[PDB]
Amino acid sequence: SAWRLLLTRPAEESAALARVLADAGIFSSSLPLLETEPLPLTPAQRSIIFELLNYSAVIVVSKPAARLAIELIDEVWPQPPMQPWFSVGSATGQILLDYGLDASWPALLDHPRLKQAIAVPGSRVLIMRGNEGRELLAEQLRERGVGVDYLPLYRRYLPQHAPGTLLQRVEVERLNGLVVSSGQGFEHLLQLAGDSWPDLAGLPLFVPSPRVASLAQAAGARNVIDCRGASAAALLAALRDQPQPAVKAY
């Protein structure tokens, strides 16, 4: 309740987060650092869509990917593909499941369903995601002799913000906590922070994962709060878990 959080994720995403937070007795102000921009892909990425059967399995990593994916399938396939599709979370999984894809979800790597589609020599998997992402899954797959290709369905950028609007936003709004939802989210913060970072660095920083926690520690953040994921809950659980907000120092 004494937490005046700053939210850095996409417009609609925080707007909702802002809501569940509001009706929970916590103020927040949103300054979007990421935006999801669809990509134009028909040159060869249109043919890859038609030959999806070339792969033994299709993995979709984000909701943005799942949604842009459905829109491509529906355009070329008079019906949904009869092939194994997977996701990390049920959130993205239902999206695919609704359009009639044979999707399943939990490590994903240990999912039996997935092992079977991979359990041949020469089998490949197609991963639909952003312009860039975590390489862990692909590297784990390749290590076990499974080929992996990518189909970038979109890109992420830093909304156009007036310089210094990060510090002045934290001041005028009296924010005593910072939240990021991705790693490239923590980047684009330390950016806008600019030369102001040496003081913001002392504020509680709520990161989605250890991976992100480590990018922040490297940057000098002194109070990194690891939440289990970027869902509203995992955040509230983290706030409740955190001592009373220490009055600003700078």
Side-chain angles (χ1 to χ4, degrees), residues 1-227 229-250:
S1 186
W3 292 94
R4 280 261 249 188
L5 300 178
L6 202 212
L7 303 181
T8 65
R9 76 194 69 199
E12 286 310 306
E13 270 201 293
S14 57
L17 182 55
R19 201 73 65 81
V20 39
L21 238 42
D23 339 316
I26 306 295
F27 174 81
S28 70
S29 169
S30 296
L31 170 71
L33 301 186
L34 288 310
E35 267 282 64
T36 331
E37 189 218 1
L39 267 162
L41 55 37
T42 181
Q45 301 158 91
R46 187 181 179 71
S47 296
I48 165 162
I49 282 39
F50 186 90
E51 283 187 85
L52 280 180
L53 303 188
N54 272 342
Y55 301 88
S56 307
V58 171
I59 302 162
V60 182
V61 70
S62 62
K63 291 191 290 192
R67 295 222 158 70
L68 278 299
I70 306 303
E71 296 309 307
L72 251 54
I73 285 69
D74 184 75
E75 179 162 283
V76 183
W77 292 64
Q79 258 175 158
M82 288 274 128
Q83 94 192 309
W85 278 54
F86 308 84
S87 52
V88 286
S90 51
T92 56
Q94 257 296 176
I95 298 166
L96 307 164
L97 200 292
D98 285 337
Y99 181 66
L101 294 168
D102 180 38
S104 60
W105 57 83
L108 185 52
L109 212 69
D110 289 49
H111 194 179
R113 195 81 174 63
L114 182 60
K115 298 210 62 163
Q116 293 168 190
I118 275 162
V120 144
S123 72
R124 314 259 295 180
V125 303
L126 180 61
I127 291 169
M128 290 182 205
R129 31 92 109 175
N131 202 198
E132 51 186 5
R134 327 249 190 96
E135 303 299 322
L136 177 56
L137 200 61
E139 287 298 314
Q140 301 176 288
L141 287 176
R142 286 173 192 139
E143 181 81 356
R144 54 201 278 170
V146 175
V148 180
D149 287 311
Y150 290 124
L151 178 74
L153 300 170
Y154 63 83
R155 183 157 180 262
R156 282 185 168 176
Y157 63 64
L158 174 77
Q160 199 48 209
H161 287 154
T165 50
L166 187 277
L167 183 57
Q168 84 176 68
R169 182 61 156 279
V170 181
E171 291 313 285
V172 180
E173 289 311 305
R174 227 115 42 69
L175 288 336
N176 58 339
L178 310 167
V179 182
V180 288
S181 68
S182 61
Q184 81 205 324
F186 170 63
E187 293 157 13
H188 295 196
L189 168 63
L190 181 67
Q191 190 183 309
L192 291 189
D195 314 294
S196 305
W197 172 255
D199 284 302
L200 304 171
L203 300 161
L205 172 64
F206 295 83
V207 311
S209 63
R211 178 167 211 131
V212 175
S214 169
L215 291 170
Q217 302 162 320
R222 313 155 214 146
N223 189 11
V224 182
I225 299 79
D226 190 321
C227 316
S231 72
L235 184 48
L236 310 174
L239 295 157
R240 309 179 303 173
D241 225 55
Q242 290 302 303
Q244 213 53 205
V247 52
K248 303 297 211 316
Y250 64 119

